[PDB]
């Protein structure tokens, strides 16, 4: 009797709005351009499945079309915010050691999880053995870098799909986005780009958790009276 | 009993189908969000193929009309001894200053190239710019 | 009247610079490991330059320096490789310190 009203006012109401958390105010094509998000790798490193997202090559350096990044980033931030609102477990994954410390801190600050270390075989597909039969896996995996340190796709991209976990991922021009649920074409190398991504996801997640408490609190006060 | 056939469809299609068949008793926490706000492309595995024969990538080289003026300026005068500051988003190099004057004089009706290039150098010298010819 | 991406790209200093070979740029030291200086100059990748023998102590984190660029990204395709190998760093020569 009271559960259907709960799930309808709290869980289903945010899903009826195009931008319930107003994540479009967090970034702009200019803000992305200043963070050097459009800068990709040289043409010789281009991955075939990234051609649709490439604006062009400027003297053999691929340029990422920020008009597409803006639309893909909007979807990724929106999805990420909704998953944080629903109290989903968000796991950040990246092997880029220059940003391991930054990413681990961003996860702790937003109240989420980070895995920036060597990824051991079976963390996801064999989690019950490694952690226990009652272990809860992540509801969303966010890749700030989709490649490992030998320039291959991070094993968790394949294993996240095997476990039917949606993935958000920054995909540079040398990355393979086929299995990434919400790919975001963008520069993954420059500290300005990576720092921006961490600010955006951190802000999206922090806002969505605060929104969940506001809605719940209002739903309770009105319930008593 | 989620399927682990990651190369067969997408997590959405595999999840939607197993929910219909009753294999999955409850929908995962992310399914309703994906349905309402799906990605532009459904994440389906694809195998990348190398191109063969006459197949070429559709990526085009990015060029501008002013690039011709920059190529000539670098040949005639070389790179300016002034250092580029790529941190300043409004930085203007000697080449960019040359290009802007070259563009202004072209809009004044001049159409010759060799003449429009010599008059531009004089204008900058009058303004105090240092233009040391490489040769 | 919102600026488009095509406009930002056309008027960006990195676009206006043209080819990077033998171009003088201003860099900033952001990380130091022993005598290896990691210098960002506005590109995708940083460059790594050895501390100069003369006035080595003047090069510290935050010090702005003058560089002569050679390549924005060091990459090459080797025998049998399907894609280019990249070291994920730019090639540049450290000339000295920039002062006002």
């Amino acid at each position: 009797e009271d559960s259907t009203d709960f799930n309808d006012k709290i869980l289903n109401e945010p899903l009826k709005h195009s931008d319930f958390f107003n994540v479009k105010e967090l970034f702009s094509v200019r803000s992305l351009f200043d963070a050097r998000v459009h800068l990709g790798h040289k043409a010789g490193c281009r991955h075939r499945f990234m051609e649709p997202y490439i604006f062009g090559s400027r003297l053999d350096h691929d340029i990422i079309d920020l008009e597409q990044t803006a639309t893909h980033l909007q979807l990724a931030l929106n999805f990420t915010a909704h998953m944080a609102y629903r109290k989903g477990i968000i796991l950040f994954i990246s092997r880029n050691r220059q940003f391991s410390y930054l990413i681990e801190n961003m996860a702790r600050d937003c109240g989420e999880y980070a895995h920036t270390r060597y990824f051991r075989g079976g963390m996801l597909t064999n989690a019950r053995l490694l952690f226990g039969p009652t272990v809860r896996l992540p509801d969303l995996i966010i890749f700030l870098h989709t490649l490992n340190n030998i320039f291959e796709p991070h094993v968790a991209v394949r294993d996240a799909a095997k476990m039917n976990i949606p993935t958000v991922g920054i995909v540079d021009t040398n990355c393979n986005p086929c299995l990434i649920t919400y790919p975001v074409p963008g520069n993954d190398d420059s500290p300005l780009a990576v720092h921006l991504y961490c600010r955006l996801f951190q802000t999206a997640i922090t806002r969505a958790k605060e929104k969940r408490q506001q809605v719940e609190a209002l739903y309770r006060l009105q319930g008593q009276k | 009993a989620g399927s682990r056939l990651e190369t067969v469809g997408s997590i959405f299609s595999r999840t939607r189908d197993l929910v219909r068949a009753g294999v999955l008793k409850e929908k995962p926490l992310w399914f309703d969000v994906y349905d309402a706000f799906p990605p532009l492309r459904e994440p389906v595995f694809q195998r990348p193929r190398v191109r063969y024969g006459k197949a070429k990538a559709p990526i085009q080289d990015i060029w501008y009309h002013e690039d011709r003026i920059r190529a000539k300026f670098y040949s005639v005068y070389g790179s300016g001894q002034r250092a580029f500051d790529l941190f300043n988003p409004n930085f203007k190099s000697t080449c960019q200053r040359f290009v802007e004057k070259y563009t202004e004089l072209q809009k004044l009706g001049e159409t010759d190239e060799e003449k429009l290039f010599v008059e531009t150098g004089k204008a900058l010298l009058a303004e105090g710019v240092i233009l040391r010819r490489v040769g | 009247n919102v600026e488009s991406f095509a406009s930002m790209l056309r008027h960006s200093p990195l676009t206006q610079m043209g080819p990077a070979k033998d171009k003088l740029v201003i860099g900033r030291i952001f990380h130091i490991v022993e005598n290896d200086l990691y210098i960002d100059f506005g590109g995708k990748f940083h460059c790594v330059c050895r501390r100069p023998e003369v006035d080595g102590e003047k090069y510290q984190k935050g010090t702005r320096v003058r560089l002569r660029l050679l390549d924005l990204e060091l990459t090459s395709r080797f025998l049998g490789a399907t894609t280019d190998t990249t070291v994920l760093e730019a090639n540049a020569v450290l000339l000295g310190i920039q002062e006002s």
């Binding site: 062009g56 003297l59 | 085009q60 080289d61 990015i62 060029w63 501008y64 009309h65 690039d67 011709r68 920059r70 190529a71 670098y74 | 488009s4 095509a6 406009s7 790209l9 056309r10 043209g18 080819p19």
Partner: peptide, 26 residues
């Protein structure tokens, strides 16, 4: 359409092909 879009043309910065020390000599 839009003036700031890239235009199709040949590389203006392309360097002339290198020649051997005897290029053009009998």
């Amino acid at each position: 359409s839009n003036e700031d879009l890239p235009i199709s043309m040949e590389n203006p910065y392309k360097e002339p092909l290198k020649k051997c020390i005897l290029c053009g000599k009998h």
